[PDB]
């Protein structure tokens, strides 16, 4: 006999199923099925050119052009350097770090765990496994900001009272005025952003 075989996937069916999912490269066409886009290495992200994207204090275009901060490993992002994060600063009036940072992924990453093998030549194997909930891009960036910035604050207390003191503040306006009036240099830019 002949019957109109039910289509395994319906367009309205997928629209409802993805209510919970907000992933551009991941969709669930079926109840348990998943249609995905193949992975590409991020070293090619340099080849993108466009206008800046100003979300709070973060410039996503510079993140696309960034090389140090695009690593998928959580430890390599939580242990990075301020000079790398200083490239992503387009504040223009942002009061809080968190308000700027809320424009970053909150999903867990993968982290590289290393374990010994216990052989005659002792060697360690490192493998990437999905991290727990507390290891996300936002958390890694927050840790990087707070740990490195403390190293910058304690290292720029020209005044004895501290970074927040009015005299140290005055020295800061002096320095930034000097760099604004002077010709721009990447040393000057990195100090300014930090």
């Amino acid at each position: 006999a002949e019957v109109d075989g039910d289509q395994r996937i319906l367009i309205r069916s997928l629209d409802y199923l993805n209510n919970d999912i907000f992933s551009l490269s991941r969709i669930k066409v079926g109840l348990d099925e998943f249609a995905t886009i193949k992975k590409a290495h991020f070293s090619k992200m340099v080849s993108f050119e466009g206008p800046p994207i100003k979300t709070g204090l973060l410039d996503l275009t510079e993140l696309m052009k960034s090389q140090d901060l695009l690593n998928l490993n959580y430890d390599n992002i939580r242990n990075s350097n301020l000079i790398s994060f200083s490239k992503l600063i387009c504040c223009e009036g942002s009061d809080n770090i968190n308000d700027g940072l809320e424009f970053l992924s909150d999903d867990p990453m993968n982290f590289t765990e290393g374990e010994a093998i216990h052989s005659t030549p002792i060697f360690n194997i490192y493998y990437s496994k999905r991290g727990e909930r507390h290891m996300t891009y936002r958390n890694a960036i927050k840790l990087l900001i707070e740990r490195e910035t403390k190293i910058f604050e304690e290292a720029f207390t020209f005044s004895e009272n501290g970074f927040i003191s009015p005299e140290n503040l005055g020295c800061l306006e002096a320095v930034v005025s000097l760099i604004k009036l002077l010709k721009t240099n990447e040393w000057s830019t990195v100090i300014d952003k930090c």
């Binding site: 350097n81 190293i151 290292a155 005299e167 005055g170 002096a174």
Partner: peptide, 30 residues
């Protein structure tokens, strides 16, 4: 401090060089 000791010195030296090529009390007063 080792991470910023070079960067700050280079920044100051380049600013001195630029301002020369163009041609304490300060903290207390602020």
């Amino acid at each position: 401090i080792p991470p910023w000791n070079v960067m700050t010195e280079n920044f100051k030296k380049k600013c001195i060089a630029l301002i020369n090529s163009k041609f304490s009390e300060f903290t207390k007063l602020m």
